[PDB]
Design an enzyme around this catalytic site. Structure first.
Site, mmCIF file in Angstrom:
data_model
loop_
_atom_site.group_PDB
_atom_site.id
_atom_site.type_symbol
_atom_site.label_atom_id
_atom_site.label_comp_id
_atom_site.label_asym_id
_atom_site.label_seq_id
_atom_site.Cartn_x
_atom_site.Cartn_y
_atom_site.Cartn_z
ATOM 1 N N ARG G 10 -0.788 -10.758 -3.006
ATOM 2 C CA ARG G 10 0.637 -11.102 -2.925
ATOM 3 C C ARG G 10 1.288 -10.811 -1.581
ATOM 4 N N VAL G 11 0.652 -9.976 -0.768
ATOM 5 C CA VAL G 11 1.004 -9.763 0.646
ATOM 6 C C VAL G 11 0.204 -10.663 1.589
#
Lengths: 57, 114, 163, 49, 232, 114, 91
Positions: G10-11
């Site tokens: 998600r990063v």
């Protein structure tokens, strides 16, 4: 030609008799369906006007 | 219906009924698949899967993951689209046409792309 | 949303007026047997003539027991509403329309035949004369209700085609 | 064919006669429904007052 | 709840046994159906040969070999299952039938339905198109005595021209145990296919007027036999 | 069978065997569906559904639950009725006719009322 | 044994180098849709030529992505190895 015209008239008139009886039933039940549709449209139009005077009051 | 209006409430209950019936068929679906259902249930499940997918959306926050832009759908267009879905106007479109899409004009654009 | 199978009231027909004990006196057992039969027959390809009649009666009763919030029926309207279901007067009304039939009939009875409601409230019973009058009104209303009602298979021949 | 055409003529005449009966009964019932919802409107105005 | 989950494991463990039993029964019945297909194949090949010889000698004026002047209606025979549990088999059949109907109504013929098997009879009971005649009791074990009656009824509806200008059959063509598809074939009017290169008693025309109703019966029987193999 | 006698014991055991096979079959009937089953199993299911209902009774304490008065079924009539039911002697009666009914005389009067 | 769909970062995608981002920019979806297509088509007789091509591409992308233990590939080699599969040179 006239004995042929008796056979033609008899066959056409019998076929049209069944057609006209079927149309008698169809016309009566179609007029009752139109009358029922008009009755439920007048009954629902009365309820809609009644709901309008309720929320207006 | 006293707060959202009659039409919005009616549409939301039709969607919830469809998804409830689908979730109560899921125990048969998981074993046999869709086809072994009755026709009145199979008709329902095809639009239930389309509704289940059309509740998805490409969000403004999703752009950082998907790269695709976000979409906003106004309430009027939401009610209209689910009214048409539950009445069965879109059963001819494939389920992949409804994923991650914002509103009817974008559903049409995605259905043309397939 | 009452789960008619598990829900119960152990006081039963002591907590009802006589007219409701008449029209509804087994309605929980009829609806729980309907939910059992509807769970069982959900996948049968066909059904017996009586099984069909039960499964099509239950759907009239369930649609008849739906009710929008803040619409309290008086008991004199509830006994007539249940009378339509348990005597089978709704059996000919299509399931989808049963709620419109119930609403329109309770308005009609209250408009023209308020003596039925008055009798039930004053006497607590459906008298046989009130039952005969109510049945007449149900049958007069059922007439006025607008319900929603290629590869080609070839013979070869071993001779040339004509010009 | 004379029987069938007389059955059509009579069935049409019967249909219009009882249609007039049904529309007259529906007009009466609509007026009664409007009076009853006017009485309900009065009872709601009394509740608010 | 553990009592609920134990009940669901006991349920699913009975269902796993009962579906494995019927997978193995279907693995037997595909071999029986292929045996009946290959036992019926030599007759169909020899009627085809005899029909090619008679047509070679015939004037070809037989009703089943000519296009009707007005394409008033088309008959569609849809072949489907009586038993359930067949998966997409009936869905494929009924999807090929509804494609055929969209084509026929695009040419300008309204289809009239004849149905074999109880599942398509249910589908066309739900969708409000009528079925003219049906049969149900034999889709898993079709005997020739059934295909005879089906082909009699279809040909009598063609020759009545209340009648059809053409007729078709919709069924799945077993081509391997790993590969079947629904196919639609026009059974009447038959094509004639001229190709590059007998005594007849009493006459070639009299035989050809007797044999075409039997050819339509053997082509319907071979369609019920391949339907029953692909059902299994 | 030493105390109640073999005629009672056999019948109680045949009813328990049928109802046990019916509870073994309810999982299959809920998902695959009744017409899938063997003719012997499907006949047993159509007997078990009648035996289940014929074990229900209009009790005299349940006057308020049912409206109808209560009944007492003699033991000899109970054994005769279940000995008939387990051998199929009532498969021609509608399934509802057995529900809440006080023995064979009332079963006959209810079946002929339907 | 990376199970796509349920595996995610998600990063990531902010830090992934431009060349790797250009070559892999559809690959996650092209694998998830291959896993569902294969789960379906394993119990089907036949399928359209476009779906059969996407099934074969997906199977050669899975064979492209596996690698032996203690063989870490430099990024300058990973981008080329994924180019082979995503541009269709493995077809």
């Amino acid at each position: 030609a006239e004995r042929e015209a008796m056979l033609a008239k008899t066959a056409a008139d019998n076929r049209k008799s069944a057609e006209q009886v079927a149309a008698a039933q169809a016309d009566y039940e179609k007029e009752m369906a139109e009358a029922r549709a008009q009755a439920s449209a007048l009954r629902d139009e009365a309820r809609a006007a009644g709901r309008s005077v309720v929320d207006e009051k | 219906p006293a707060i959202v209006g009659d039409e919005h409430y009616r549409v939301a209950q039709e969607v919830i009924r469809i998804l409830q019936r689908y979730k109560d068929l899921q125990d048969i679906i998981a074993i046999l698949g869709i086809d072994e259902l009755s026709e009145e249930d199979k008709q329902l499940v095809n639009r239930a899967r389309r509704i289940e997918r059309f509740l998805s959306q490409n969000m403004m926050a999703a752009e950082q993951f998907t790269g695709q832009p976000g979409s906003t759908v106004p309430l009027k267009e939401t009610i209209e689209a689910f009214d048409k879905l539950t009445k069965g106007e879109f059963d001819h479109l494939p389920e992949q046409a409804f994923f991650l899409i914002g509103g009817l004009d974008d559903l049409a654009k995605k259905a043309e792309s397939l | 949303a009452i789960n008619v199978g598990v829900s119960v009231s152990r006081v039963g027909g002591a907590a009802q007026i006589k007219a409701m004990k008449e029209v509804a006196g087994s309605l929980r057992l009829d609806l729980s047997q309907y939910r059992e039969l509807e769970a069982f027959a959900a996948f049968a390809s066909d059904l017996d003539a009586a099984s069909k009649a039960q499964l099509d009666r239950g759907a009239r009763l369930v649609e008849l027991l739906k009710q929008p919030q803040y619409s309290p029926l008086a008991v004199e309207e509830q006994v007539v509403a249940i009378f339509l279901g348990t005597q089978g007067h709704l059996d000919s009304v299509p399931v989808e329309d049963v709620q419109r039939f119930e609403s329109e009939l309770l308005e009609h009875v209250k408009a023209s035949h308020s003596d039925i409601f008055d009798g039930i409230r004053e006497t607590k019973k459906l008298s046989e004369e009130a039952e005969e009058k109510l049945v007449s009104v149900i049958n007069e209303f059922k007439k006025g209700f607008q319900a929603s009602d290629l590869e080609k298979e070839s013979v070869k021949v071993r001779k040339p085609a004509p010009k | 064919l004379a029987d069938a055409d007389a059955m059509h003529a009579k069935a049409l005449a019967d249909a219009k006669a009882e249609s007039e009966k049904v529309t007259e009964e529906a007009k009466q019932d609509s007026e009664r429904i409007a009076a009853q919802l006017s009485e309900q409107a009065g009872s709601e105005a009394e509740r608010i007052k | 709840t553990l009592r609920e989950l134990r009940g669901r494991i006991r349920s699913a463990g009975s269902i796993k046994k009962i579906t494995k039993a019927q997978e193995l029964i279907a693995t037997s019945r595909i071999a029986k159906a292929q045996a009946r297909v290959e036992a019926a194949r030599p007759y169909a090949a020899e009627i085809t040969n005899m029909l090619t010889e008679l047509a070679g000698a015939s004037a070809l004026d037989h009703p089943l070999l000519v296009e009707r002047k007005q394409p008033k209606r088309a008959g569609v025979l849809v072949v489907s299952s009586d038993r359930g549990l067949c998966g997409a088999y009936n869905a494929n059949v009924l999807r090929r039938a509804e494609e055929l109907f969209s084509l026929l109504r695009d040419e300008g013929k309204d289809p009239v339905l004849y149905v074999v098997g109880r599942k398509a009879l249910g589908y066309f009971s739900f969708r409000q198109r009528t079925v003219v005649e049906s049969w149900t009791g034999f889709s898993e074990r079709p005997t020739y005595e059934n295909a005879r009656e089906i082909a009699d009824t279809l040909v009598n509806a063609f020759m009545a021209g209340l009648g059809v200008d053409e007729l078709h059959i919709v069924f799945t063509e077993f081509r391997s145990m790993l590969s079947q598809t629904a196919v639609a074939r026009r059974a009447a009017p038959m094509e004639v296919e001229y190709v590059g290169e007998y005594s007849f008693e009493p006459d070639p025309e009299t035989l050809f007027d007797a044999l075409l109703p039997r050819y339509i019966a053997t082509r319907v029987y071979a369609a019920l036999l391949e339907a029953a193999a692909s059902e299994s």
